Amino acid sequence: NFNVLFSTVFPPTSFGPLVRKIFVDGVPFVVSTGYHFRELGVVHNQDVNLHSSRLSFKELLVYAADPAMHAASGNLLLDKRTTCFSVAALTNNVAFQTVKPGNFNKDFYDFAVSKGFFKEGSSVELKHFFFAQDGNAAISDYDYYRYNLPTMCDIRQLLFVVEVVDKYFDCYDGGCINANQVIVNNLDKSAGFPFNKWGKARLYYDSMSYEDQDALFAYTKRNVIPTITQMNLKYAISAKNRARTVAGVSICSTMTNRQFHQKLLKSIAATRGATVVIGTSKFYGGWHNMLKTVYSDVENPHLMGWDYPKCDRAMPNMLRIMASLVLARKHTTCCSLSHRFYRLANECAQVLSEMVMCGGSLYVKPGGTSSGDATTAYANSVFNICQAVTANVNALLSTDGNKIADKYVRNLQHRLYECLYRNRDVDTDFVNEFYAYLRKHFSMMILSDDAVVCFNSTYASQGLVASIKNFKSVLYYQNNVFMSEAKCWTETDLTKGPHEFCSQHTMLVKQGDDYVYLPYPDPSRILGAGCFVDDIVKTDGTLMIERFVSLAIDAYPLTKHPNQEYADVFHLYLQYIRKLHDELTGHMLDMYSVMLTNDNTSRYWEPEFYEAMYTPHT
Amino acid sequence: VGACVLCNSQTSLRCGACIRRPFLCCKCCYDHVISTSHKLVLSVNPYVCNAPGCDVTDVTQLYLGGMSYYCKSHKPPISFPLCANGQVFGLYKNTCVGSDNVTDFNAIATCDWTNAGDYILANTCTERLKLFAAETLKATEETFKLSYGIATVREVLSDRELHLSWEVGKPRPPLNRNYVFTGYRVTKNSKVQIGEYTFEKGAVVYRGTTTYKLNVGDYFVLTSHTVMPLSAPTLVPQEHYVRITGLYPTLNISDEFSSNVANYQKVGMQKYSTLQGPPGTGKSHFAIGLALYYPS
Amino acid sequence: AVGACVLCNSQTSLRCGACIRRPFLCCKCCYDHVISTSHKLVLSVNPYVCNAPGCDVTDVTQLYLGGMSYYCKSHKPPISFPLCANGQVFGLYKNTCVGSDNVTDFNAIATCDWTNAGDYILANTCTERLKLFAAETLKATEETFKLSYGIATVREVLSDRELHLSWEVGKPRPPLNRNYVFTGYRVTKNSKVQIGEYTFEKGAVVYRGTTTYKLNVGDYFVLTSHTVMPLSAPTLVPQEHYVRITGLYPTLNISDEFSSNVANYQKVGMQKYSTLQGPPGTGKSHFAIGLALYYPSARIVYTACSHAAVDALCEKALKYLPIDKCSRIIPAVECFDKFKVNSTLEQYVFCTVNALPETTADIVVFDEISMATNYDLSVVNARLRAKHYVYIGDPAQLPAPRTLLTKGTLEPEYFNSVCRLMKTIGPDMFLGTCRRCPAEIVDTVSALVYDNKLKAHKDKSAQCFKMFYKGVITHDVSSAINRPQIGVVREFLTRNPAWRKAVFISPYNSQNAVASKILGLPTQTVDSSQGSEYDYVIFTQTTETAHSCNVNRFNVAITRAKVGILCIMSDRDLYDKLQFTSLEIP
Amino acid sequence: FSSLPSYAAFATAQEAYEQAVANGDSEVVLKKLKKSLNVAKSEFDRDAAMQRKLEKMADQAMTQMYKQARSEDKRAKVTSAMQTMLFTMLRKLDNDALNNIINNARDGCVPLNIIPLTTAAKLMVVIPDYNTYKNTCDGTTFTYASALWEIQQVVDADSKIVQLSEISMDNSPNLAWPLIVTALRAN
RNA sequence: GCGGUAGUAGCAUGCUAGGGAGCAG
RNA sequence: UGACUGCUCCCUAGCAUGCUACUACCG
Ligand SMILES: [Zn+2]
Ligand SMILES: [Zn+2]
Ligand SMILES: [Zn+2]
Secondary structure (H helix, E strand, C coil): CHHHHHCCCCCCCCCEECCCEEEECCEEEECCCEEECCCCCEEECCCCCCCCCCCCCHHHHHHHCCHHHHHHCCCCCEECCCCCCCCCCCCCCCCCCCECCCEECHHHHHHHHHCCCCCCCCCCCCCCECCCECCCCHHHHHHHHHHCCCCCCCCCCHHHHHHHHHHHCCCCCCCCCCCCCCCCCCCCCCCCHHHCCCCCHHHHHHCCCHHHHHHHHCCCCCCCCCCCECCEECCCCECCCCCCEECCECHHHHHHHHHHHHHHHHHHCCCCCCCECCCCCCCCCCHHHHHHHHCCCCCCCCCCCCCCCCCCCCCCCHHHHHHHHHHCCCCCCCCCCHHHHHHHHHHHHHHCCCCCCCCCCCCCCCCCCCCCCCCHHHHHHHHHHHHHHHHHHHHHHCCCCCCCCCCCHHHHHHHHHHHHHCCCCCCHHHHHHHHHHHHHCCCCEECCCCEECCCCCCCCCCCCCCCCHHHHHHHHHHHCCCCCCCCCCCCCCCCCCCCCCCCCCCECCEECCEECCECCCCHHHHHHHHHEECCCCCCCCHHHHHHHHHHHHHCCCCCCCCCHHHHHHHHHHHHHHHHHHHHHHHHHHHHCCCCCCCCCCCCCCCHHHHCHHHCCCC | CCECCCCCCECCEEECCCCCCCEECHHHHHHHHCCCCCCCEECCCECCCCCCCCCCCCCCCEECCCCCCEECCCCCCCCCCCCECCECCCCCCCCCCCCCCCHHHHHHHCCCCCCHHHHHHHCCCCHHHHHHHHHHHHHHHHHHHCCCCCCCEEEECCCCCEEECCCCCCCCCCCCCCCCCEEECECCCCECCCECCCECCCCCCECCCCCCCCCCCEEEECCCCCCCCCCCCCCCCCCCCCCCCCCCCCCCCCCCCCCCHHHHHHHCCCCCCCCCCCCCCCCCCHHHHHHHHCCC | CCECCCCCCCCECEECCCCCCCCEECHHHHHHHHHCCCCCCCECCCECCCCCCCCCCCCCCCCEEECCEEECCCCCCCCCEECCCCCCCCCCCCCCCCCCCCCHHHHHHHHCCCCCHHHHHHHHCCCHHHHHHHHHHHHHHHHHHHCCCCCEEEEEECCCCCEEEECCCCCCCCCCCHHHCEEEEEECCCCEEEEEEECECCCCCCECCCCCCCCCCCEEEECCCCCCCCCCCCCCCCCCECCCCCCCCCCCCCCCCCHHHHHHHHHHCCECEEEECCCCCCCHHHHHHHHHHHCCCCCEEEECCCCCCCHHHHHCHHHHCCCCCCCECCCCCCCCCCCCCCCCCCCEEECCCCCCCCCCCCEEEECCCCCCCHHHHHHHHHHCCCCEEEECCCCCCCCCCCCCCCCCCCCHHHCCHHHHHHHHCCCCECCCCCCCCCCHHHHHHHHHCCCCCCCCCCCCCCCCCCCCCCCCCCCCCCCCCCHHHHHHHHHHHCCCHHHCCCCEEECCCHHHHHHHHHCCCCEEECCCCCCCCCCEEEEECCCCCCCCCCCCCCCCCCCCCCCEEEEECCCCCCCCCCCCCCCCCC | CCCCCCHHHHHHHHHHHHHHHHHCCCCHHHHHHHHHHHHHHHHHCCHHHHHHHHHHHHHHHHHHHHHHHHHHHHHHHHHHHHHHHHHHHCCCCCCCHHHHHHCCCCCCCCCHHHHHHHHCCCCCEECCCHHHHHCCCCCCEEEECCEEEECCCECCCCCCCCCCCCCCCCCHHHCCCCCEECCEEEC
16 A cells, blocks of 8 residues: 555656566576566565576466567557557557448348337337447557556555455355366467467467476466556447457466466355355346345345446556455465465566557556456456445444434444554454444345445435445545446335346246246347347358347347337247248258258247246256 | 259269369269269368368268268268268259269360360360360360479570579470460569560570569469359350341441451351451451441 | 387387387387387387386286276276287277388397497398488497496696596596597586586596696596487488589589599589599598589588598688688587688588588588498488588598497498498599509508509608517506507617607507607507698507407508508518518617 | 177077078977077177277277377477577567666666667657647657657558658648657667 | 066266357446 | 356267166076
8 A cells, every 4th residue: 555655756667577688598588587566566586597408388488478578679669649658569560450340130120120110219229239440449448547546545444344345255265276177168269469379278278288287376476477468359239339448368377367266266156145146147037036135134225226437447456456365365274475475466467567468569557457367257346345345434434423313333333433443453353243234234236346235225314324425435535436426226116126237127027926027138239139240141040040049038028028119029039030940941941852840949939938947947 | 052064953062083173963973973083072061081080082981970971990880871872962962963974074074185085075065064174174284384394594694595494303395485484583582573584495595575684593484373164155146136237237338348248248147257268368357347337 | 299100101109118219110010029029118199007006017018908097907997908909009090000021120220239240230231211210229329338438527637638537436437539529517516617628548647638728626527428319311312323414514624633533523413422432642632622613603511520530621622712602610629710600601611510500502522431320421411402422531441439349340331321332332433643652552552452443653762661570468447558569669769760750650549648758759549540640650559459450450550651650560460461671670 | 790709609509590490390499599599699798799888998099199199299389489489589689788788787687668768779659640740750850768869761550651741730631640650769 | 477687779867078159247 | 359257048979877668598
């Protein structure tokens, strides 16, 4: 925290790696041998070999994934487009990259109007399109970091909000695992900068054996490896034209953050009934069980979504650290201590200050999450719980405690001040007393930051818990953004669920003979995804009857809806599958001289298939 | 995804050992292969057992199976032998007619283009098959015309005299006016431009097309391209119209060529005029006097 | 990890790890060699061993495939599999292999451990592929033979040419000098430092080295090993005489300082591999030198097996030849850089295979052939490509230290390929312009071994004298002093001073390093001093062994002088065949 | 599957059973033909029923080791490429001014974001528009990082060349605008 | 007589791996 | 140029389990 302040005053051409010319086989290179962060001071390597006749394979790796050689051998660069401190350049011609538009899928369109859709005046209307972008969009989007400032965070209350967040994450378990128990789905996804000229993560997950990956992972627990990072433009339907960009970290960062965190990660994505809800399906009546855990019992509930504007670029850096210090608090035995530190420092050197390669030209990335590492969707969740708690502590201190009526929240605030400022060490007695109160009057539920918060009310109306002016305050002074009170709702009713969570409203239909909460999407969304595809192969439908099935699986709960044209979306989709099939079949019958003889495809175009997936049994 | 040349049947197979590897049709494909030395067939993918590292060449020996192909020494037993029933399995598996007149079809494709008898055999077929024979002719020509070397001049001497060699062993060309031996110089990496020449006997006499100079280790060929398949008939649909209607039959003819309209009137009432006329016999005068018999 | 098999060319993946070099073995031939020998380990993409928890057994035939590991008898689960079977061990491409009746040769070379000359009869007598693999294993045997010598650790430095030199325990001390081009290193603490490259003699250890230093304490010196690397290219290429002198450019004018040298430049301009039958010192150092000017437009590569053998070739280069387009690389032993460093693309180029990059030329010269190994020739054919090839010297000289020979001698034509090629295919070329020797030894070589092609050169000027003496022998560690010859030194040096101002040739230069303390004639190793010999020398037999008593040691000993050297050939082979005057003991 | 050991026993026994059907003798002939058959079939119960799983296991393991040899060649290819990239990208390190700026530091350690800024031998500056173009790379020389730079060529978006005569205010809005100036280090 | 066990099909369940596609942050 | 993570459908392959009948052989 202190270093974060005392490190504005010094110059910014003296942060980053260090280097030093080492001689391998009587030839000199440059290689990183430390770091200088704005927070954690200086950090020196520990296994530097001033000579070597031959480098192995692990070596070759950790020397070609480094900025030092590339940068220290490249033409200078001055970039007058941004404010971010550029660094070097590699090519001789900068590269300007663009984004194409969608593809029209006509036959679905005529078939869609035949049934009488898109009548000027209707309630469903195209809205999600494939927006285009010109040349310099990549960099005019990278630029947005200039919303990320150095921030000092208050401390005698961060050192308490961190207890309570940890208490939330307590039922779980985790530790280091070995290089033969990791699990990696989809093994042909890119490997990041220096390596993606040779092949996908597969090739570097083979050639490196098991004791290799173990030498490597138990090596960077006494070292530091700076890394690069491409920057990529997404290409996907959307309702706004500011392009989206996602950071493709290089292999030798994941290939160790995995082995480090995997167990805790896959033990969050397999517990039901807690606060975080990653890994809890909504099908087969999961959504109902979510929304019925939240309403646990709180006496006069409401609800209360909210949203952070520009979340992954405006995030301070103290809160990213605190995230990692709560995700690595389980290794009380697997790892020692200086092991834990060189691991934290390796994270901060790879995904909170690395050397973005946006274009053909290294830069520097001030702070804030990189949303493509190997522990985002949980880092964001713990940061989110952080904001919720600290809004509670502000809301509970800042109250004229002479008018408070009870006699238990009075003493709660008294000892909250004591243990907050007049104390230096923990008090797990009172941390427990608080967290109990806090989960009796403020249940929550937290995906990767889209929250819902069924707060008791007749408190939050005398400021004994959060509200939303309080999230306004906190976001302001501790995250530096203004949370415009026009994307934060508040259902005052519960028989209808939350106005929106994971971007899906919620209808209390009455199926079987009882009442459930199916979750429907957004008619324009489903239609749009029907009409606009990427590639001319998505277009032709007969080849891909497998999309319309899924889209119809998602567009089902619209059938029970009250408004009309909604339900007609579903029926359109069913008749469309029927047409697709019974045309393909004969079509292939002619050029053949036979075709389909054994069916029960007829289940695809009647609703009693699609209905199975919203009744609790599988 | 087109038609074999003698069945008007869309197919999707491709013979193995041929020139361009032509389109063949299931049964018709069989009647091509089983009556010559063709021993593999290519489709949307080629027909070869995809058991890793396997090595299988004759279609017959394979068998289908799961979403792939296999082979006796590698397959799963739940086979389905391809070359079966006298009809090798592939798209359009039913609608195919095949033919017995194939060893002439084959002869057209299975003429090594060494014989004037092969020319008689190209004279022995029809329109699809004849355009086919012609393209096979062109292709065999071109794969022979690239059987010579690359005329590398290392030591420059005078214009039309140099110290010329070649690459290694590759034979010597009939150096007359047949070969425009054009040069491709080398500067650093790429083979680029000595220019278009014509080599004769020296000290080696060349004929620089555009004004050109010679270098060192830079050489000369006639790099080939891609003769492609055709469509419409070489001889048009012959139909001498009932009349020469729909044109502008002007009255005033340059009569210096008093044999010209004597055929213009027969040509204006005839599609194709492929005539026997000796050299300089009112033919070079013919069309240009037609230019006055028909300026429109 | 895949590749051709060393016998069948059949694409395989088996490695007869029981040998030292691990060659690639076809399945069927892997059987054949595992059967009639003790080759009982074969590695594929794994080692074939019952990797049961704590087993050990290592026999392909004896091993049983079990599930996915491997097992022998007491380990296999119920579902198992004879690895050995059908005469075809279980390795990739089991269905593609040609076998070979030729297997006893392989069994031999695997079994034959290089100890007698019959071993070398083998090496020369098999297939190009198999003699190639042989020569490689040969070098393996040599690196296990010679690094099986002590570590010359000078613990104390006395002066110049006398040191207190020690070794490791038990590991034997090498003999003498030339076959032992030493290169010492000094300790620091955790690592080693340079010292220098030497040639080693006894005392106190007198030395006459190739490099220097400031020699200190613990100064250890080694005959450093290396790694004999695969011999991809052959040793020699199959030739042909060309219809024309193509690839080369005919000259019309030419300096006829070399007469019968253009007559052979012409025949090599049309034939690939070639070599002259020219006696020691006959203007070969003028032959290719004049050739360089003969076709004033050809790429010549100048080489020999030793950097100190390319002496003469390096002298007259910058004399006859122009000074510009000549080149020879010198590795950081210091050699003749009167050419230039790092300049492949120069019309004239020199050096020895010990250090030169991959290249390609047109004409090839190679001296120092009688002491060549097929391994070297292989290197040569691997480093460059040309159109015609010339190997310089004659076979009928000294061969390299075939040290693992401990019995029968190796015959000349059996040294390397060209050796058997120059008597049965015959001499591609020959030099007769024998500008070196008088009338005695010219006819002596001609009617002695050197196939009666050299005539009487110049005059009998009278200085080589010979007796009918005896001389008693004595030995030591691996050398021989001879007091009944060190006395005979002065005993003959009596009557005329035309002896005293000479050099003292010796079989084992302990005798010279000691008798120079009496007189002072130079220490000379008989091995590779041809071309670095004096026109007037002295020789003493010192030893009556085959190292002295052959037929080809004295033809590299009486060729050296001009018309004068003491030929005490008291040894009991070659005496009453050559004729001189017999001056009694005086 | 047609050449196993016990196949011969089966062949003789059931050829004999058919010889007995050819004679057609007693009912004890049936006792024979029905204990022989069933026992001889109790043979193939095992022969062509086990070796057929042995071939499964065999060819399976063989294909696995094929795949492994493939992976192991890929390792070699990637190593060779990475290595040659390093040993061709080092040669431009400019080993002089560097050599100085290292051998002066407290100990070898000199933050990276100054090695190019003080030793690089070429600038490349990107400009959005004219009004900013003036306040830097104007004319034929500018200074930045306090070394003296001299322009020598200018491109633009489409990668072509413009002469520094053309970048006024009037001829501005015809310039693919993010001009990319490529200077050199002048002493 | 009843069970034994062994080969042969047939069905279901589950687990594995590889393939195609969809949605959410 | 194609990031990490979660849920879901569809088509092959393999293993296990059971279900399964027909044959067997023994008691
Ligand atoms: Zn750990
Ligand atoms: Zn056909
Ligand atoms: Zn196959």
